[PDB]
Design a protein around this ligand. Structure first.
Ligand SMILES: Cc1cc2nc3c(=O)[nH]c(=O)nc-3n(C[C@H](O)[C@H](O)[C@H](O)COP(=O)(O)OP(=O)(O)OC[C@H]3O[C@@H](n4cnc5c(N)ncnc54)[C@H](O)[C@@H]3O)c2cc1C
Ligand code: PCD
Ligand code: PCD
Ligand code: SF4
Ligand code: FES
Ligand code: FES
Ligand code: FES
Ligand code: FES
Ligand SMILES: [Cl-]
Ligand SMILES: [K+]
Ligand code: NA
Lengths: 760, 157, 323, 48, 48, 48, 157
């Protein structure tokens, strides 16, 4: 058996030897050096651009401007307003204005300096409030007030629900913008073949299909002339879930130069690409009954979204979509505003749009619980979904729910009953719940295709090749797909060779975003494996003169149930299956049923709709040094309901990575702008946690067994991130008695709260 | 201007004409073609370019190639014996101290330096030695486990 | 390839040859390059040549002298200093400060000379060529205006080196060599409180060694504050040395770093002869505040940086007192 | 063609097909004379 | 060197009514391509 | 004539790039002669 | 022993430390990584390694790398302008002067030398210039046609 076995990732050997080739490692001796000229202004009109002197420099092969990129792009079909190279105006400092391809780095740098751009500088807006003022310039003509999207929804009778409450409290929380800091720098290698008018790209993307679509659209080139390959990828965490400007620019330069262009990006430029979690202000209002039952919820979320639309519409809907599906809440009112600002566009980052409002809800729920004299773990148990299946007011369908077990498990593992409220001054414990979808059940592009497709090939040699368009970004999708297919087939994992993410070879996949891969590609892989197993059982039965129903496949042996016959080896069955057939190729697909795609009557409900949710409960132990105000997270105990852990080893690592990223946002990470200038553009002043202050993290796996997931599986990588923020928020309150209203809980913020406490 | 650079790299004698201003990182990746050593930042902040110079860790992006003349330099490509993984490499693979794999060559070289100097490190000594190596995937937990596992394996060998 | 100017790299075998190499225009000393190379890569400097000091025989030795003093060559690594048994036992503040610098891999090569002579820092300075040129550069390099203190009478970049204050309270001496020969000064005198001309080394001069005297009745410690627990420069750092006579302060030396354009001694004579109590600690905080000039050259705020600088000065002295 | 590809993807996704060819038995020589398979073929290229 | 990748592309494109440029040929890699008996006795154009 | 043989001892797999007109026959004989399962062998013919 | 070798290769300045006994063929293929230049024999019999040195053909397998110091060396990789074929390359492709492609780089370099020296060669002059280049696939007929086509196309422009 392969499912449920702790399994090192199938591509780990190449990672530990340095043999794995990431985009910037790919050899291409004829490659030119690509460089982008970025706007030094946060907001400005482009009056003129003269590239004549740059083009005349020996060694410069091509220079491009926005005059050559008349088609904009955006990850959402309804909001494509970013041009590969700027047209008419720039909207953030770093916005691409021109690009060059040269024989070497020093020549490319000189060329950028020779390009003359005449700008008409405009006032820039750093905050949602400044951008929404009546006299502000509209960044985009179709949104005069700079509000990209507003959400105003009410589920149930909210006024009557609050009237039924015994206690009502409201508080505002603010959350700094954060960045993914995947360790690999952005890069694209673009090979344009002018003889055939074809383009091949190797790029740092989690969404090769989206890259294929946007490169074809933006270069006005038929999709059949483009091939997209994702080589090994050094993470992404959401950053690379939209086609990015540098990928399209590399393609544009390669075509202009009629050759190959390698466009590498610096770490500063990777921070400029951004697409991270937006600065968000959340007003949270909760009404409770005296016994702790939730009576009502009303929240407001305002996001500073940066300069272009991107994922914005989706992100702002997520601020309210996952207020549902965790606790039973009688009525919910949600109002939200996504506002353009003259800063790098925000986007999707692990937990996409649900982290900040989840943190705010958990923190106020705990605070109100204290006021009612109810333990923070108990107030969550009191409010769990009353029965399963459960359909939320947002039309989500919860078919598996491991929250009760997650809570009991972390309560026991952390010694919560024993220790909560009995720690030394300066130390504390906190608990929180969080959850996330196992893939958005509705694709972004309506094409009527299956939601995942996997192909298997088996020939005379007996090796099975599994072809998938899915992007393994370090999470292990190539191992996952192999495990589930091998389990169905009764073969060893070593018999499966995975070819992935190369558009000329592998079936299209929608991308590694919203934790959809295990659920969808896992089910498609099972589907393909069942098709192949059917073909082999048919051949074995014939060779064994038995009926197909009586054939059992045990560890690469096809036996006749009950019989004594030794049966046939897998290789003997392959040989039999080749007769009158030759090479076997099968296809498996998976499509989320319509009942899991929301309710058309609730506008935008597809966002937040999914086949199932991963749930996590976590307890965090932390201490606070009152002299410096420094908060130290010592340990986290986290129980995650992943439906069925296909690879427990990877589930543990994914959960530790998710909790840890939340710890970075909770304690030290934050971007900083000064009149449009990025101040945090390096990994010294953007404080990704080091191993020294990072907590130990103990993971407990809960298996609720989802009825529709592959072998019962749900996602295992995003549902645990958000809970860390409110859990450590509570630990800090127990340690030193202050209640933070702004993340990160860095020493500067803690010392201000301590000084105010003492002043009062 | 180029000058002669002599050193031992991954067990082999090298004698190359190298620009005086060339960083060790660029010499390894571009002159020799050893792409295991990575670049994760714009200078000295991430540890992804960590290599060994006379058994001690060194940041290849913040070292001039000419500064290692006459020394023993080792990159991740040197650890395996032909295709067989070293115990440290096997531990990172088996314990999942590596996910995306990008910080792994630097993390493993820093770990190799630690184990050559302190064969049986405490958890705190492991954290102290890897303090400048950033990883965004793992939350570090299993990286510590990989180093402990490797230390034990090397000791009973 | 990462862009650098096309400089020559000299690798002298003796201090005399290093000094002669430094006579040329646009020529800079080079230690392990952990501070200098990241700055040159960002375009902060356009040298014609670098003079590598790491190949100089004998420049990295740590030894004890007749009197029981410590002598450290400018080339000794921070790792060797932090791990040296004699230093940890007799001059723990220096081992503490050396170990607090950057990360362990930087310390494996970073030199004492380079740590003392590291460049000052400011968020308008430690930025790329694209970033700075887009902002019109600044008074410290290629511009004419200071963006932190608009008056622009000087550069106010902050000195964040950890080792300097520890050596200053330990009353260390600096041995300097140059075209005029050898000279020695109290380590505190190696610094000038000016962001863009922060060292008192002249053209062609190099820090060759540091000598620390026997401690006598002095105890000393160094405390650093940073948000992460490794790699970060000090947001504020304070070293102190104490002589205690019964229940009174017989001697006291306090040095701060991460607060001004130079690491500085705080005049604390007012505390001598008195007790170490709450009133004395508040007096000390006010003296540290007066010497400090916390400005927004950092991404972290001035309010916090100043508050913790005062808080840890009291904590480090209280630690020495209670021991 | 591209409009038809889009239509064909509906309810299908990636299309994979297989084609095969096998020489009919009459072109494999005399089934009872094993050596006659050498020289048997579907057809001959002739040259003058 | 005889042109079997071109030959296979030509005949498939003719049947489909498409340009030769629309066909990308992947050949002779056992992990990806169907087994072929070999380029011997001039069998490839006729059989493949 | 030339052969590049990559043997992966961690997985006990062999990948060959070789100067052959008959990659299927090579696959069969390498498996038989090395007494190695054919499923552990990959044969690729690059340009020839 | 190694010594400094400076030359211009495919339009770029090279300054490398190269063994005194290194053949130009091995320097191109292994030191620089330009695999277009081929080895078809054990020494001077086939022309597959033909490259240009100061516009004239030279057998890279029978020339020491150090003998081309200070000269202009060109291999097949230098003829195209980025990805755009030269007229000579386009003619070999379009007229089928190349089948398996193995003798092609040497055949094209010998042809390039000929056309630089004699822009409108007769059939006899084409055969005379290619006399030492062996091809086993074509019977030479279409190679001659390729050179004639390229010559006429270069005379246009
Ligand atoms: C991410 C990061 C974090 C860091 N954190 C810290 C920290 O926490 N604390 C800290 O103090 N430093 C820190 N640094 C700075 C630097 O790494 C250390 O100060 C270090 O000790 C530099 O020594 P070095 O030998 O590498 O010097 P180099 O970088 O070689 O030289 C630095 C400067 O000193 C000059 N110089 C070198 N040797 C001499 C000499 N003998 N005489 C005269 N001039 C000389 C050079 O010309 C140059 O201007 C950090 C650097 C980075 C990149
Ligand atoms: N039940 C179960 C589940 C799962 N698993 C596992 O785990 C993993 C994961 O899974 P999921 O959860 O399903 O996911 P996917 O979809 O595959 O993926 C994606 C994700 O992934 C994660 N993770 C990770 N890791 C790494 N390493 N890197 C990364 O980058 C990342 N990113 C992150 C994110 S953020 Mo977005 O994008 O914001 O939307 S989304 C995301 C897989 O593979 C495997 O290994 C198992 O085993 N079991
Ligand atoms: N009708 C017709 C036919 C054909 N074609 C063409 O021609 C070719 C060929 O074909 P064929 O004849 O069919 O053949 P194949 O099978 O494919 O192949 C194989 C062969 O091939 C030939 N040729 C050649 N070429 C080159 N260039 N190289 C070679 O090597 C060679 N080899 C030779 C031989 S010798 Mo044996 O092996 O003895 O058995 S066999 C052989 C093809 O591809 C195409 O291009 C056409 O067009 N049409
Ligand atoms: S303090 Fe002023 S002059 Fe000095 S680096 Fe900063 S901005 Fe420039
Ligand atoms: S690449 Fe980041 S420290 Fe060297
Ligand atoms: S394994 Fe991905 S950055 Fe460490
Ligand atoms: S390889 Fe045959 S002549 Fe050179
Ligand atoms: S084309 Fe094959 S040897 Fe000439
Ligand atoms: Cl969020
Ligand atoms: K307006
Ligand atoms: Na030009």
């Amino acid at each position: 058996g392969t499912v449920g076995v702790r399994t090192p990732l199938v591509d780990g050997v190449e990672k530990v030897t340095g043999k794995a080739k990431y985009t910037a490692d790919i050899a291409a001796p004829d490659a030119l050096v690509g460089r982008i000229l970025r706007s030094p202004h946060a907001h400005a009109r482009i009056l003129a651009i003269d590239t004549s002197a740059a083009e005349a420099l020996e060694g410069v092969i091509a220079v491009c401007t926005g005059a050559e990129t008349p088609v904009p792009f955006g990850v959402l079909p309804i909001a494509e307003n970013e041009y590969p190279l700027a047209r008419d105006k720039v909207r953030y400092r770093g916005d691409p204005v021109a690009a060059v391809a040269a024989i070497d780095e020093v020549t490319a740098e000189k060329a950028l300096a020779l390009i003359k751009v005449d700008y008409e500088v405009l006032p820039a807006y750093m905050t949602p409030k400044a951008a929404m003022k009546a006299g502000a310039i509209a960044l985009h003509d179709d949104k005069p007030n700079n509000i990209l999207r507003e959400v105003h929804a009410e589920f149930g009778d909210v006024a009557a629900a609050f009237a039924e409450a015994d206690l009502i409290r409201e508080k505002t929380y603010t959350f700094a913008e954060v960045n993914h800091v995947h360790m690999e720098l952005n890069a694209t290698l673009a090979e344009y073949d002018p003889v055939r008018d074809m383009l091949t790209l190797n790029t740092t993307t989690q969404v090769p299909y989206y890259v294929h679509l946007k490169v074809a659209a933006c270069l006005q080139m038929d999709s059949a002339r483009i091939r997209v390959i994702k080589p090994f990828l050094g993470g992404g965490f959401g950053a690379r879930t939209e086609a990015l400007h540098f990928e399209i620019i590399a393609g544009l330069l390669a075509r202009k130069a009629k050759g190959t262009v390698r466009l590498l990006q610096t770490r500063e430029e990777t921070f400029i690409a951004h697409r991270g979690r937006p600065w968000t202000e959340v007003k949270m209002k909760i009404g409770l009954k005296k016994d702790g039952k939730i009576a009502a919820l009303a929240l407001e979320a305002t996001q500073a979204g940066g300069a272009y639309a991107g994922y914005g519409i989706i992100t702002i809907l997520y601020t309210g979509a996952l207020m549902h599906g965790l606790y039973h809440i009688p009525a919910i009112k949600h109002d939200a505003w996504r506002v353009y600002t003259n800063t790098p566009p925000c986007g999707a980052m692990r937990g996409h749009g649900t982290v900040d409002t989840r943190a705010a809800f958990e923190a106020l729920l705990t605070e109100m619980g204290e006021e009612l004299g109810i333990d923070s773990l108990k107030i969550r148990q009191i409010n769990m979904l009353p029965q399963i299946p459960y359909v939320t007011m947002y039309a989500q369908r919860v078919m598996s729910y491991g929250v009760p077990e997650c809570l009991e498990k972390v309560k026991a593992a952390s010694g919560w009953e024993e220790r909560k409220g009995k720690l030394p001054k300066g130390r504390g414990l906190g608990i929180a719940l969080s959850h996330f979808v196992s893939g958005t059940s509705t694709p972004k592009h309506w094409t009527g295709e299956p939601h995942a497709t996997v192909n298997l090939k088996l020939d005379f040699d007996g090796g099975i090749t599994l072809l998938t368009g899915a992007a393994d970004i370090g999470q292990g999708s190539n191992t996952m797909a192999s495990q589930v297919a091998a389990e169905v087939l009764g073969v060893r994992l070593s018999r499966i060779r995975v070819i992935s993410a190369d558009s000329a070879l592998t079936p299209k996949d929608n991308g590694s975003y919203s934790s959809r891969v295990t659920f969808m590609v896992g089910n498609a892989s099972i589907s393909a494996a069942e098709e192949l197993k059917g073909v082999l059982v048919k051949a074995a039965a014939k060779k064994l003169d038995a009926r197909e129903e009586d054939i059992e496949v045990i560890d690469e042996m096809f036996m006749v149930s009950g019989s004594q016959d030794p049966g046939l080896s897998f290789q003997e069955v392959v040989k039999a299956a080749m007769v009158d057939s030759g090479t076997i190729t099968v296809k498996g697909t998976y499509t989320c049923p319509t009942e899991f795609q929301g309710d058309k009557k609730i506008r935008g409900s597809a966002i937040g709709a999914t086949m199932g949710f991963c749930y996590a409960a976590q307890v965090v132990e932390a201490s606070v040094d009152e002299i410096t105000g420094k908060v130290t997270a010592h340990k986290v105990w986290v129980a995650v309901d992943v439906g069925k852990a296909l690879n427990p080893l990877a589930v543990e690592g994914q959960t530790q990575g998710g909790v840890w990223m939340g710890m970075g946002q909770a304690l030290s990470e934050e971007t900083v702008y000064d009149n449009g200038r990025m101040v945090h553009g390096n990994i010294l002043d953007y404080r990704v946690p080091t191993i020294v202050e990072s907590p130990d993290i103990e993971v407990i796996i809960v298996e609720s067994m989802d009825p529709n997931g592959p072998f019962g599986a749900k996602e295992a990588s995003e549902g645990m991130l958000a809970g860390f923020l409110p859990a450590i928020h509570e630990a800090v309150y127990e340690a030193v008695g202050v209640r933070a209203t702004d993340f990160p809980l860095s020493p500067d913020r803690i010392t201000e709260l301590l000084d105010a406490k003492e002043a009062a | 201007m180029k000058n002669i650079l002599r050193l031992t790299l991954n067990g082999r004698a090298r004698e190359d004409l190298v620009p005086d201003n060339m960083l060790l990182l660029d010499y390894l990746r571009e002159t020799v073609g050893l792409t295991g050593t990575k670049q994760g930042c714009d200078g000295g902040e991430c540890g992804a370019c960590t290599v060994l110079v006379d058994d001690r860790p060194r940041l290849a992006c913040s070292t001039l190639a000419h500064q290692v003349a006459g020394k023993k330099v080792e990159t991740v490509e040197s650890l395996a014996t032909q295709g067989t993984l070293s115990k440290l490499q096997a531990a990172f693979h088996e314990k999942l101290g590596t996910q995306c794999g990008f910080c792994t060559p630097g993390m493993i070289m820093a770990s190799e330096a630690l184990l050559r100097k302190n064969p049986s490190p405490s958890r705190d000594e492991i954290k102290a030695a890897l303090a400048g190596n950033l990883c965004r995937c793992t939350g570090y937990v299993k990286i510590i486990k990989s180093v402990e596992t490797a230390a034990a394996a090397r000791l009973c060998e | 390839m990462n862009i650098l100017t096309d400089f020559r790299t000299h690798r002298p075998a003796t201090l005399a040859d290093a000094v002669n190499a430094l006579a040329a225009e646009a020529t800079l000393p080079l230690g392990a390059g952990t501070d200098l190379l990241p700055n040159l890569r960002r375009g902060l400097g356009h040298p014609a040549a670098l003079v590598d000091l790491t190949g100089i025989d004998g420049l990295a030795t740590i030894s004890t002298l007749a009197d029981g003093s410590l002598r450290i060559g400018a080339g000794a690594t921070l790792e060797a200093i932090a791990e040296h048994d004699a230093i940890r036992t007799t001059w723990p503040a220096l081992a503490q400060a050396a170990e607090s610098v950057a990360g362990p891999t930087h310390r494996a090569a970073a030199t004492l000379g380079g740590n003392l002579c590291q460049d000052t820092r400011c968020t308008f300075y430690n930025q790329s060529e694209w970033w700075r040129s887009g902002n019109g550069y600044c008074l410290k390099y290629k511009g004419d205006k200071c963006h932190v203190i608009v008056k622009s009478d000087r550069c106010y970049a902050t000195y964040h080196g950890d080792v300097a204050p520890a050596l200053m309270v330990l009353d260390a001496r600096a041995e300097i060599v140059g075209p005029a020969g050898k000279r020695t000064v109290p380590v505190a005198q190696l610094f000038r409180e000016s962001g863009a001309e922060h060292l008192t080394l002249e053209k062609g001069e190099l820090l060759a060694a540091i000598e620390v005297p026997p401690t006598g009745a002095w105890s000393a410690a160094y405390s650093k504050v940073r948000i992460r627990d490794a790699v970060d420069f000090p947001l504020a750092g304070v070293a102190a040395a104490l002589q205690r006579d019964g229940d009174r302060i017989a001697g006291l030396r306090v040095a701060i770093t991460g607060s001004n354009s130079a690491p500085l001694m705080v005049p604390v004579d007012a505390l001598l002869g008195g007790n170490w109590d709450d009133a004395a600690a508040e007096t000390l905080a006010q003296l540290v505040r007066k010497t400090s000039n916390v400005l927004r050259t950092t991404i972290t705020g001035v309010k916090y940086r100043r508050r913790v600088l005062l808080a840890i000065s009291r904590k480090v002295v209280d630690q020495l007192w209670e021991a």
